Amino acid sequence: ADLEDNMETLNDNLKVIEKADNAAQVEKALEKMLAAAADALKATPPKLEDKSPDSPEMRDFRHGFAILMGQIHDAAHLANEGKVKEAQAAAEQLKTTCNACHQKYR
Amino acid sequence: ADLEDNMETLNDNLKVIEKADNAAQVEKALEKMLAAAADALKATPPKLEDKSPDSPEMRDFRHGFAILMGQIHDAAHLANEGKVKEAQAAAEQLKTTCNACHQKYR
Ligand code: HEM
Ligand code: HEM
Ligand SMILES: [Zn+2]
Ligand SMILES: [Zn+2]
Ligand SMILES: [Zn+2]
């Protein structure tokens, strides 16, 4: 998947998490988000097309996913434990990260 | 990249880290390692080449990388602060997460 498709995946699954009945659905949705975030980390977003691979901006971008994958992983543990609404709230607070990178780079 | 190439990148940077001259270099290598761990996440190891991508084995396999990227992440911050030494000792203990996975799965 390219970046836009990976982002849609992060989007489709946050939606699923909000409305899931049970832990297993939340946990799965979260696995799917982890994979997409991971697959997207190597992308070059259109706004940063003209900076070098090793530029502070590109490194910042990559670090944005390291945060995101970190919180996703944590949300995965809560859901894996059976804690549905804590997991759903962990998915909601992830949005800070989505937003802080869209402000800079989308 | 394929899994061999990613593991090569992991091993390689650890040796760049073991003998780095400044914090910048430790940070750069740790970052390269995070990206190679990100990319490897979705590989299927030869040990599980017959297993479904959603088997319990493959799940536990992907967890190993989630854990490893977390620890790389924290090591990256010690590097970034400029605590070169502590970062070098941090990277050395990552080998636990390397061997732990290798022993189950390589
Ligand atoms: C789970 C949290 C996130 C959600 C729900 C999300 C959602 C989205 C959506 C819906 C789009 C529109 C793309 C399309 O039309 O298919 C998009 C674009 C984009 N996102 Fe995210 N995102 C998240 C996290 C992030 C993070 C952490 C970063 C950066 C580190 C990021 C970087 C970008 C960029 C650069 C674009 C523009 C892509 C392009 O035009 O090629 N996103 N995102
Ligand atoms: C910094 C930590 C790690 C280092 C330095 C490392 C290094 C290596 C090396 C040198 C190899 C031999 C393959 C080659 O010749 O390149 C290898 C293979 C392998 N590693 Fe790692 N590894 C690390 C962590 C992990 C983790 C966390 C996992 C799984 C969660 C993993 C899974 C595997 C597998 C499945 C192979 C066999 C692939 C093959 O050679 O066909 N490794 N790794
Ligand atoms: Zn892809
Ligand atoms: Zn960080
Ligand atoms: Zn974990």
Residue position matching structure tokens 């940077």:
B13
Q: What is the C-alpha separation between A22 and B94, in angstroms, rounded?
A: 34
Query: Which residues in chain A are closer than 8 Å to B38, comparing Cβ atoms?
Result: 38-39, 41-42, 65, 69
Q: Which two tokens stand for residue A104?
A: 């800079």
Query: Which residues in chain B are closer than 8 Å to A69, comparing Cβ atoms?
Result: 38, 66, 69
CB contact under 8 A, A38 and B34: no
Domain ranges for chain B: 1-106
Beta carbons of A42 and A2 less than 8 angstroms apart: no
Q: Please state, in angstroms and as integers, the Cα–Cα distance from residue B53 to each residue in A22, A54, A91, following that order.
A: 22, 33, 24
How many CB contacts within 8 angstroms connect chain A with chain B? 40
Other CB atoms closer than 10 Å to residue A86's CB: what's the count? Answer: 13
Q: Which two tokens stand for residue B36?
A: 């190679």
Beta carbons of A72 and A37 less than 8 angstroms apart: yes
Resolution of the structure in the document, Å: 2.3
CATH code of domain A1-106: 1.20.120.10
Of residues B31, A104, A100, B40, the one with CA closest to residue B14: B31
Taking the centre of ligand 2 as the mean of its atom positions, its distance from the CA of residue B18, in whole angstroms, is 18
